Design a protein around this ligand. Structure first.
Ligand SMILES: *[C@@H]1O[C@H](CO)[C@@H](O[C@@H]2O[C@H](CO)[C@@H](O)[C@H](O)[C@H]2NC(C)=O)[C@H](O)[C@H]1NC(C)=O
Ligand SMILES: *[C@@H]1O[C@H](CO)[C@@H](O[C@@H]2O[C@H](CO)[C@@H](O)[C@H](O)[C@H]2NC(C)=O)[C@H](O)[C@H]1NC(C)=O
Ligand SMILES: *[C@@H]1O[C@H](CO)[C@@H](O[C@@H]2O[C@H](CO)[C@@H](O)[C@H](O)[C@H]2NC(C)=O)[C@H](O)[C@H]1NC(C)=O
Ligand SMILES: *[C@@H]1O[C@H](CO)[C@@H](O)[C@H](O)[C@H]1NC(C)=O
Lengths: 50, 56
C-alpha cells in the first residue's frame, strides 16, 4: 500500500511512543541527521574492511 | 489514531488498516503550533461538538 515517506516515518515515530508532530515539525533536521548517518556508513566501510 | 484522507472533495480521518471515514473533529485530532511549520499541510474545517450545544 503506498504511503508518503514522511508519513511512514510519522507512523514509525508514533510506534516508539514519540508523538507524530515531533517528526513533522523537525522533518528537515531528521532527514539531515539520516543523510549524514548513511554518509558515515559509506566512509567507515571505505576506510576499513575490519 | 488514524490518517487524514480525501475522497477527492471532502476530508476525513480513518483508521490505518480498514477504510472507515469519520468527520474531522476536536476529538479525533490534537493541535501543535501554527500552520507555517509542517511540509505539505492542507486547509479544512475541524468540527467542534460543543458549539451547537452552546447554541442552546
Ligand atoms: C538538536 O540537535 C541538532 C543536531 O543533532 C541541532 O541541529 C543543528 O542546529 C544548528 C542551529 O542551532 C545548525 O547550525 C545545525 O546545522 C543543525 N544540525 C543539523 C544536522 O541540522 C539542534 O539545534 C538541536 N536542538 C535543540 C533544541 O537542542
Ligand atoms: C465525497 O464525500 C462527500 C461527503 O460524504 C460525498 O457526498 C456528496 O458530496 C457532494 C459535493 O461534493 C454533495 O453535493 C452531495 O449532496 C453529497 N451527497 C451525500 C450523500 O452526502 C461525495 O459523493 C463523495 N465523493 C466525491 C467523489 O466527492
Ligand atoms: C490556507 O488557509 C490560509 C488562511 O486563510 C491561507 O493563507 C492566507 O492566504 C491569503 C490568500 O492567498 C493571503 O492573503 C493571506 O496573507 C494568507 N495568510 C497567511 C498568514 O499566510 C492559505 O493561502 C491557504 N492555503 C491554501 C493552499 O489554500
Ligand atoms: C509533492 O511533490 C511535488 C513534486 O512532485 C511538489 O511540487 C509538491 O509541492 C509536493 N506536495 C506536497 C504536499 O508535499
Amino acid at each position: 500500500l503506498q504511503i508518503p515517506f514522511a508519513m511512514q516515518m510519522a507512523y514509525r515515530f508514533n510506534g516508539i511512543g514519540v508523538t507524530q508532530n515531533v517528526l513533522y515539525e523537525n522533518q528537515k533536521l531528521i532527514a539531515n541527521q539520516f543523510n549524514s548517518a548513511i554518509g558515515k556508513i559509506q566512509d567507515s566501510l571505505s576506510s576499513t574492511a575490519s | 489514531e488514524g490518517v487524514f484522507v480525501s475522497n477527492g472533495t471532502h476530508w476525513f480521518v480513518t483508521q490505518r488498516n480498514f477504510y472507515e471515514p469519520q468527520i474531522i473533529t476536536t476529538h479525533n485530532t490534537f493541535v501543535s503550533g501554527n500552520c507555517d511549520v509542517v511540509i505539505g499541510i492542507v486547509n479544512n474545517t475541524v468540527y467542534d461538538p460543543l458549539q451547537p450545544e452552546l447554541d442552546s
